Coordinates of C-alpha atoms in Angstrom, one line a residue:
Chain K
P70 CA -1.8 32.0 -26.8
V71 CA 1.8 33.0 -26.0
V72 CA 4.3 31.8 -23.7
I73 CA 7.2 34.8 -22.5
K74 CA 10.0 32.6 -22.2
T75 CA 13.9 33.7 -22.1
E76 CA 14.3 33.2 -25.9
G77 CA 11.3 35.4 -25.7
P78 CA 7.8 35.5 -26.4
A79 CA 7.0 31.9 -27.9
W80 CA 3.4 31.3 -29.7
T81 CA 1.4 28.5 -28.9
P82 CA -2.0 27.5 -30.4
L83 CA -5.3 26.9 -29.1
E84 CA -5.8 23.2 -28.9
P85 CA -8.5 22.2 -31.5
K86 CA -10.0 19.8 -29.5
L87 CA -11.0 22.6 -27.4
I88 CA -12.1 24.6 -30.8
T89 CA -14.1 22.1 -31.9
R90 CA -16.1 21.5 -28.4
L91 CA -16.7 25.0 -28.8
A92 CA -17.6 25.3 -32.0
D93 CA -20.1 22.6 -31.5
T94 CA -21.5 24.4 -28.4
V95 CA -22.4 27.3 -30.0
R96 CA -23.9 24.8 -32.8
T97 CA -26.2 23.2 -30.3
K98 CA -26.8 25.7 -27.2
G99 CA -26.6 28.9 -29.8
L100 CA -24.6 32.0 -29.0
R101 CA -26.0 33.2 -26.3
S102 CA -26.7 30.8 -24.0
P103 CA -25.1 31.3 -20.8
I104 CA -23.0 28.2 -20.5
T105 CA -21.8 29.6 -24.4
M106 CA -20.6 33.2 -22.6
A107 CA -18.5 30.9 -20.1
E108 CA -17.3 28.5 -22.6
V109 CA -16.0 31.6 -24.6
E110 CA -14.8 33.5 -21.0
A111 CA -13.0 30.5 -20.6
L112 CA -11.1 30.3 -23.7
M113 CA -10.6 34.2 -23.6
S114 CA -8.6 33.3 -20.4
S115 CA -5.6 33.9 -21.6
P116 CA -4.5 36.9 -23.6
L117 CA -4.7 35.9 -27.2
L118 CA -2.9 37.4 -29.9
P119 CA -5.1 39.1 -33.4
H120 CA -4.4 36.0 -35.0
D121 CA -5.4 33.9 -32.6
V122 CA -8.8 35.5 -31.6
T123 CA -9.3 36.0 -35.5
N124 CA -8.9 32.3 -35.9
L125 CA -11.1 31.3 -33.3
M126 CA -14.2 33.5 -34.1
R127 CA -13.3 32.1 -37.8
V128 CA -13.9 28.6 -37.0
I129 CA -16.9 29.3 -34.3
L130 CA -19.1 31.5 -35.6
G131 CA -21.0 31.3 -39.0
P132 CA -19.8 33.4 -42.2
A133 CA -22.5 36.5 -41.7
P134 CA -22.3 36.3 -37.4
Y135 CA -18.5 36.4 -38.2
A136 CA -18.8 39.4 -40.4
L137 CA -20.8 41.2 -37.8
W138 CA -18.2 40.4 -35.6
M139 CA -15.3 42.2 -38.0
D140 CA -17.7 44.9 -37.9
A141 CA -18.1 45.2 -33.8
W142 CA -14.4 44.4 -32.9
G143 CA -13.3 47.3 -35.3
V144 CA -15.9 49.9 -33.5
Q145 CA -14.5 48.7 -30.0
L146 CA -10.7 48.8 -31.0
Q147 CA -11.4 52.3 -32.5
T148 CA -13.3 53.2 -28.8
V149 CA -10.1 51.7 -27.2
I150 CA -8.0 54.0 -29.6
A151 CA -9.8 57.1 -28.5
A152 CA -9.4 56.5 -24.8
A153 CA -6.1 55.5 -25.5
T154 CA -5.3 59.0 -27.3
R155 CA -7.4 60.8 -24.8
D156 CA -4.6 59.0 -22.2
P157 CA -0.7 58.6 -22.4
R158 CA -1.1 56.5 -19.8
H159 CA -3.0 53.4 -21.4
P160 CA -1.2 50.3 -21.1
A161 CA -1.1 49.7 -24.4
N162 CA 0.7 52.8 -24.9
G163 CA 3.9 54.4 -23.8
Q164 CA 5.5 57.5 -22.3
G165 CA 7.0 58.9 -25.6
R166 CA 5.1 59.8 -28.6
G167 CA 6.7 56.9 -30.1
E168 CA 4.8 54.3 -28.6
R169 CA 1.4 55.3 -29.4
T170 CA -0.7 52.6 -30.4
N171 CA -2.2 52.2 -34.1
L172 CA -4.9 50.2 -35.5
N173 CA -2.7 49.0 -37.5
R174 CA -1.3 47.3 -34.5
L175 CA -4.1 46.2 -32.9
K176 CA -5.5 44.2 -35.7
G177 CA -2.6 42.7 -36.2
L178 CA -2.1 45.0 -39.6
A179 CA 1.2 46.5 -38.7
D180 CA 4.5 45.7 -40.3
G181 CA 6.1 42.3 -39.4
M182 CA 2.8 41.1 -38.1
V183 CA 0.4 40.5 -41.3
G184 CA 0.2 36.6 -41.5
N185 CA 2.8 36.1 -39.2
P186 CA 1.6 34.7 -35.2
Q187 CA 5.1 34.4 -34.0
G188 CA 6.1 38.4 -35.1
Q189 CA 3.1 39.0 -33.9
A190 CA 3.5 37.5 -30.2
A191 CA 7.2 39.6 -30.9
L192 CA 6.2 43.1 -31.3
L193 CA 3.1 43.5 -29.1
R194 CA 2.6 44.6 -25.2
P195 CA 0.4 42.8 -22.8
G196 CA -1.5 45.7 -22.6
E197 CA -2.0 45.4 -26.1
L198 CA -3.2 42.2 -26.1
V199 CA -5.8 42.6 -22.6
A200 CA -7.0 45.4 -24.8
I201 CA -7.5 43.8 -27.9
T202 CA -9.4 40.6 -25.9
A203 CA -11.6 43.0 -23.9
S204 CA -12.6 44.6 -27.1
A205 CA -13.2 41.1 -28.8
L206 CA -15.4 39.7 -25.4
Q207 CA -17.5 43.1 -25.5
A208 CA -17.8 42.6 -29.7
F209 CA -18.9 39.0 -29.3
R210 CA -21.4 39.7 -26.5
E211 CA -22.9 42.9 -29.1
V212 CA -23.2 40.1 -32.1
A213 CA -24.5 37.1 -29.9
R214 CA -27.2 39.6 -28.8
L215 CA -28.1 40.6 -32.1
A216 CA -28.1 37.2 -33.8
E217 CA -30.8 36.5 -32.2
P218 CA -33.5 39.0 -30.5
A219 CA -35.0 38.2 -27.0
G220 CA -39.1 37.6 -27.1
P221 CA -41.1 40.5 -26.8
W222 CA -42.0 40.3 -23.3
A223 CA -45.5 41.5 -23.1
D224 CA -46.7 39.0 -25.9
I225 CA -45.8 36.2 -23.5
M226 CA -49.0 33.9 -22.3
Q227 CA -48.9 30.7 -20.7
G228 CA -50.2 28.2 -22.7
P229 CA -53.2 25.7 -22.0
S230 CA -51.2 22.9 -21.8
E231 CA -47.6 24.6 -20.1
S232 CA -46.6 24.5 -17.1
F233 CA -45.9 27.2 -14.7
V234 CA -42.4 27.1 -14.3
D235 CA -41.7 26.8 -18.1
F236 CA -43.7 29.9 -18.5
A237 CA -41.6 31.6 -15.5
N238 CA -38.6 30.8 -17.3
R239 CA -39.2 31.6 -20.5
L240 CA -40.7 35.0 -18.9
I241 CA -38.1 35.7 -16.7
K242 CA -36.0 35.1 -19.6
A243 CA -37.7 37.3 -22.1
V244 CA -37.7 40.4 -19.4
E245 CA -34.1 40.5 -18.7
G246 CA -32.7 40.0 -21.5
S247 CA -34.8 43.1 -22.7
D248 CA -34.6 47.3 -23.5
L249 CA -35.8 48.0 -20.0
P250 CA -33.6 48.9 -17.0
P251 CA -32.7 46.9 -13.8
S252 CA -34.6 48.7 -11.5
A253 CA -38.0 48.1 -13.5
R254 CA -37.6 43.8 -14.0
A255 CA -39.2 42.6 -10.8
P256 CA -42.1 44.8 -11.0
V257 CA -42.6 44.2 -14.4
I258 CA -42.2 39.9 -13.9
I259 CA -44.7 40.2 -11.3
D260 CA -47.4 42.0 -12.7
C261 CA -47.0 39.8 -15.8
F262 CA -47.5 36.5 -14.1
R263 CA -50.8 38.4 -12.3
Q264 CA -51.9 39.3 -15.6
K265 CA -50.8 36.5 -17.9
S266 CA -50.6 32.7 -16.1
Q267 CA -54.2 31.6 -17.5
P268 CA -56.8 32.5 -14.8
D269 CA -56.4 29.3 -12.5
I270 CA -53.5 30.7 -11.6
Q271 CA -54.4 34.4 -11.6
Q272 CA -57.4 33.6 -9.3
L273 CA -54.4 31.5 -7.1
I274 CA -52.4 34.9 -6.7
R275 CA -55.1 36.8 -6.6
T276 CA -56.3 34.9 -3.1
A277 CA -53.1 34.9 -1.3
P278 CA -53.7 35.7 2.3
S279 CA -50.4 37.2 1.8
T280 CA -48.4 40.0 0.0
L281 CA -45.8 38.5 -2.8
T282 CA -43.7 41.5 -3.7
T283 CA -40.9 39.1 -5.4
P284 CA -41.3 36.8 -8.1
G285 CA -39.5 34.2 -6.4
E286 CA -41.8 34.3 -3.5
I287 CA -45.1 34.2 -6.2
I288 CA -43.3 31.0 -8.0
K289 CA -42.9 29.5 -4.6
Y290 CA -46.4 30.1 -3.5
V291 CA -47.9 28.7 -7.0
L292 CA -45.9 25.8 -6.5
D293 CA -46.7 24.9 -3.3
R294 CA -50.7 25.4 -4.1
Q295 CA -50.8 24.3 -7.8
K296 CA -53.6 22.0 -8.8
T297 CA -52.0 18.5 -9.5
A298 CA -52.8 17.4 -12.7
Chain E
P43 CA -74.8 -18.8 33.3
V44 CA -74.4 -20.7 37.2
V45 CA -75.6 -19.3 40.6
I46 CA -73.3 -20.8 42.8
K47 CA -76.0 -21.2 46.0
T48 CA -75.4 -23.0 49.5
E49 CA -76.3 -26.5 48.1
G50 CA -74.3 -25.9 44.9
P51 CA -73.7 -24.1 41.7
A52 CA -77.1 -24.3 40.2
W53 CA -77.5 -23.1 36.1
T54 CA -79.6 -20.6 35.1
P55 CA -80.4 -20.5 31.1
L56 CA -79.9 -17.0 29.1
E57 CA -83.3 -15.7 28.0
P58 CA -84.4 -16.6 24.8
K59 CA -85.5 -13.6 24.7
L60 CA -82.0 -11.3 25.0
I61 CA -80.5 -14.5 22.7
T62 CA -83.6 -13.5 19.7
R63 CA -82.7 -10.0 19.9
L64 CA -79.0 -10.5 19.6
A65 CA -79.4 -12.9 16.8
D66 CA -81.4 -10.2 14.5
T67 CA -78.7 -7.9 16.2
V68 CA -75.8 -10.4 13.9
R69 CA -78.7 -10.9 11.2
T70 CA -79.2 -6.6 10.7
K71 CA -76.1 -5.3 11.9
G72 CA -73.7 -8.2 10.7
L73 CA -70.2 -9.6 12.8
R74 CA -68.1 -6.7 12.9
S75 CA -70.8 -4.1 13.5
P76 CA -69.3 -2.5 17.4
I77 CA -72.5 -2.0 18.1
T78 CA -72.5 -6.1 17.7
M79 CA -69.8 -6.7 19.2
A80 CA -70.9 -4.3 22.4
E81 CA -74.2 -6.4 22.6
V82 CA -71.8 -10.2 22.5
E83 CA -70.0 -8.3 25.0
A84 CA -73.0 -7.8 27.2
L85 CA -74.5 -11.2 26.8
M86 CA -70.4 -12.2 28.2
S87 CA -70.7 -10.6 31.6
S88 CA -71.4 -13.4 33.2
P89 CA -68.7 -16.4 32.9
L90 CA -70.7 -19.0 30.8
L91 CA -70.4 -22.8 30.5
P92 CA -68.9 -24.3 27.5
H93 CA -72.9 -25.4 26.9
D94 CA -74.0 -21.9 27.6
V95 CA -71.4 -20.4 24.8
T96 CA -72.2 -23.4 22.2
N97 CA -75.6 -22.8 21.9
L98 CA -75.3 -19.0 21.9
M99 CA -73.0 -19.9 18.9
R100 CA -75.0 -22.0 17.4
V101 CA -78.5 -19.9 17.6
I102 CA -76.8 -16.0 16.7
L103 CA -74.2 -17.5 14.1
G104 CA -74.6 -19.5 10.9
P105 CA -73.9 -22.9 9.7
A106 CA -70.6 -21.5 8.3
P107 CA -69.2 -19.2 10.6
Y108 CA -70.1 -21.7 13.2
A109 CA -67.6 -23.8 12.2
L110 CA -65.0 -21.1 11.8
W111 CA -66.2 -20.2 15.0
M112 CA -66.1 -23.8 16.7
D113 CA -62.3 -24.2 14.7
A114 CA -61.0 -20.9 16.1
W115 CA -62.3 -21.5 19.7
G116 CA -60.5 -24.9 19.9
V117 CA -57.4 -23.3 18.7
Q118 CA -57.5 -20.5 21.1
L119 CA -58.5 -22.9 24.5
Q120 CA -55.4 -24.6 23.2
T121 CA -53.3 -21.7 23.7
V122 CA -54.4 -21.4 27.0
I123 CA -53.5 -24.9 28.0
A124 CA -50.3 -24.5 27.0
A125 CA -49.9 -21.6 29.0
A126 CA -51.0 -24.1 31.8
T127 CA -49.1 -26.5 31.3
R128 CA -46.4 -23.4 31.3
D129 CA -47.5 -22.0 34.9
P130 CA -48.8 -24.1 37.8
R131 CA -50.5 -21.3 39.1
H132 CA -53.0 -20.9 36.3
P133 CA -57.1 -20.0 38.2
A134 CA -58.2 -23.1 35.9
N135 CA -55.4 -25.6 37.4
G136 CA -54.6 -26.3 40.7
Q137 CA -51.4 -26.6 42.6
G138 CA -50.9 -30.4 42.8
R139 CA -51.0 -32.5 39.4
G140 CA -53.8 -34.3 39.5
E141 CA -56.1 -31.0 38.9
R142 CA -54.4 -30.2 35.5
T143 CA -57.6 -29.4 33.3
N144 CA -57.6 -30.7 30.0
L145 CA -59.1 -29.8 27.5
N146 CA -61.8 -32.3 27.6
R147 CA -62.9 -30.2 30.9
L148 CA -62.7 -26.5 29.2
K149 CA -64.8 -27.9 26.3
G150 CA -67.1 -29.5 28.0
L151 CA -66.5 -33.8 26.8
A152 CA -64.9 -34.6 30.0
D153 CA -67.2 -37.3 32.1
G154 CA -70.0 -36.5 33.8
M155 CA -70.3 -33.0 31.4
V156 CA -71.0 -34.4 28.0
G157 CA -74.7 -32.9 27.2
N158 CA -75.5 -32.1 30.8
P159 CA -75.3 -28.3 32.4
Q160 CA -75.9 -29.1 35.9
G161 CA -73.0 -31.4 36.4
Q162 CA -71.0 -29.6 34.1
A163 CA -71.9 -26.1 36.5
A164 CA -71.0 -28.3 39.2
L165 CA -67.7 -29.8 38.3
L166 CA -66.1 -26.7 36.9
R167 CA -63.6 -24.3 37.9
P168 CA -64.5 -19.7 38.2
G169 CA -60.8 -19.6 37.0
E170 CA -61.7 -22.3 34.2
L171 CA -65.4 -20.4 33.0
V172 CA -63.7 -17.0 32.6
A173 CA -60.8 -18.5 30.9
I174 CA -63.0 -20.3 28.3
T175 CA -65.4 -17.3 28.2
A176 CA -62.7 -15.0 27.4
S177 CA -61.5 -17.7 24.5
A178 CA -64.6 -17.7 23.3
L179 CA -64.8 -13.6 22.8
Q180 CA -61.2 -14.1 21.2
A181 CA -62.3 -16.4 18.8
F182 CA -65.7 -14.5 17.7
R183 CA -63.2 -11.6 17.0
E184 CA -61.4 -13.8 15.0
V185 CA -64.1 -15.2 12.9
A186 CA -65.8 -12.0 12.2
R187 CA -62.6 -10.0 11.0
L188 CA -62.4 -13.2 8.7
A189 CA -65.9 -13.4 7.8
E190 CA -66.0 -9.8 6.1
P191 CA -62.5 -8.5 4.7
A192 CA -62.3 -4.6 5.3
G193 CA -62.7 -2.9 1.9
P194 CA -59.0 -2.2 0.6
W195 CA -58.3 1.6 1.6
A196 CA -56.2 2.2 -1.3
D197 CA -58.7 1.7 -3.3
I198 CA -61.2 3.8 -2.2
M199 CA -62.8 7.1 -4.0
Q200 CA -65.0 9.9 -3.0
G201 CA -67.4 9.6 -5.8
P202 CA -69.4 12.3 -7.6
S203 CA -72.1 12.6 -6.3
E204 CA -71.0 11.0 -2.7
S205 CA -70.7 13.4 0.0
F206 CA -67.8 13.9 2.2
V207 CA -68.8 13.1 5.6
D208 CA -69.7 9.4 4.3
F209 CA -66.4 9.5 2.2
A210 CA -64.3 10.5 5.6
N211 CA -66.3 7.5 7.2
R212 CA -65.6 4.8 4.6
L213 CA -62.1 6.3 4.4
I214 CA -61.4 5.6 8.1
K215 CA -63.5 2.1 8.6
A216 CA -61.0 0.6 5.8
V217 CA -58.1 2.0 7.2
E218 CA -58.6 1.3 10.5
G219 CA -60.1 -1.9 10.4
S220 CA -56.9 -2.9 8.2
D221 CA -53.3 -4.9 8.3
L222 CA -51.6 -0.9 8.9
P223 CA -49.6 -0.6 12.4
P224 CA -51.6 1.6 14.7
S225 CA -48.6 4.1 14.3
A226 CA -49.5 4.3 11.0
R227 CA -53.0 4.7 10.3
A228 CA -53.3 8.7 10.5
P229 CA -50.5 9.9 7.6
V230 CA -52.8 7.2 5.6
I231 CA -55.7 8.3 5.9
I232 CA -54.4 12.1 6.1
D233 CA -52.4 11.6 2.5
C234 CA -55.6 9.7 1.3
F235 CA -57.9 12.5 1.6
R236 CA -55.1 14.6 0.2
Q237 CA -55.0 12.6 -3.1
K238 CA -58.7 11.0 -3.4
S239 CA -61.5 13.6 -2.5
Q240 CA -62.1 14.8 -5.7
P241 CA -60.6 17.6 -7.2
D242 CA -62.6 20.4 -6.3
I243 CA -61.9 19.2 -2.1
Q244 CA -58.4 19.0 -3.3
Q245 CA -57.4 21.8 -4.1
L246 CA -59.6 22.7 -0.9
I247 CA -57.7 20.7 0.9
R248 CA -54.1 22.0 -0.9
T249 CA -54.9 25.8 -0.5
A250 CA -55.5 25.9 3.1
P251 CA -53.9 28.6 4.9
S252 CA -53.0 26.6 7.8
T253 CA -51.2 22.9 8.2
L254 CA -53.5 20.4 9.1
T255 CA -52.4 17.4 10.6
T256 CA -54.7 15.5 12.0
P257 CA -57.8 13.6 10.3
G258 CA -60.4 15.5 12.7
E259 CA -58.6 18.5 11.7
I260 CA -58.8 18.6 7.7
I261 CA -62.5 16.9 8.6
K262 CA -63.3 20.5 10.0
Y263 CA -61.5 22.6 7.8
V264 CA -63.8 21.0 4.4
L265 CA -66.6 21.3 6.1
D266 CA -66.6 24.6 7.2
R267 CA -65.6 26.0 3.8
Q268 CA -67.4 23.2 1.2
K269 CA -69.2 24.2 -1.5
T270 CA -72.8 23.6 -0.4
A271 CA -74.8 22.1 -3.1

């Protein structure tokens, strides 16, 4: 993090207490939990310098996820630089050709920046910072989606002893965290409620005097009329 | 029983045939059955003299219930005499202090009454007779409620082989013949139908497309849709 003061942009590091709490969050909840992504968005609020994001991912991520994240961050930054050479009005670019932003300046590899966060904060633009930050966030999302797969939705059955809300949670999780289009999730969730969800609940849904046309309505109906046991 | 004729109040005894039938009714049906209380109300129609009620309870009740009934009758007569000294306009009392009614006159222990029903019928007032009769009826009710408890309602389950109308009869009996307020019997009966009444009928009541808000409606619904077996 940088503070743009009168003397110039002064760099302030992130608290190691927040970083330790975020690292333990990633350690217990995993990379893909919505609470973890919310915490990352929180610590991704102010535009960070390449040094900050690099050290942050070095600390919170293990070695192999860190390698994957470096790869993904490079790819996303390259897409950004292609869009930048496709539009001279990038908030990282300038009007003349002398302000064109090279990947050495984005990854912090340019002259006067390697290993020095103060000089980094000096030469970098705010548009550069926000582009780097958005790129790093998208790369984190990619790596998180890659490190742990969503479980195959079509293999999910309600166990003989499992409750129905746990089964519904697991199924909705695996269906929404999958490769289906957004407009195909609700019908699939409904038809999986009807064919999975062991034959007692199957018959309970089948003999519904009303027509249930939404996963929430099916869940409410089943929770009302379920066999207390 | 007394007949207030021109010569004076002449005492007529109750038929030993009616008394024998009532005694056998109490012997087979018990003290608390509504048919028994109706029969007692029937034989408690005309105002009886202390001799009549005393011999009646001696014949129809066993020894221990008769002791209990003597106790309860004394207590109720004492409450009556307290109300009488609290109001000089009692139909047993008179206007002056010389007509105040003592418990010896109510229990038949006063002078000219001990063991003689004719003299009893002579000196007693009709208000005295009706007060004695109501007191004896209330005492009989107390002793009947005391001799046999209502079964605990919260321990009633529908047996595996028992029909539903028998279970409903037993449950409504035990709930209405208990210490609950009158305004708390219907909700308790409903919630006991729902949680007792073994899981087939439990699920039958649970999956009711209509909302059942009365024990009679629940009974009708279950009798309609019950599994004939």
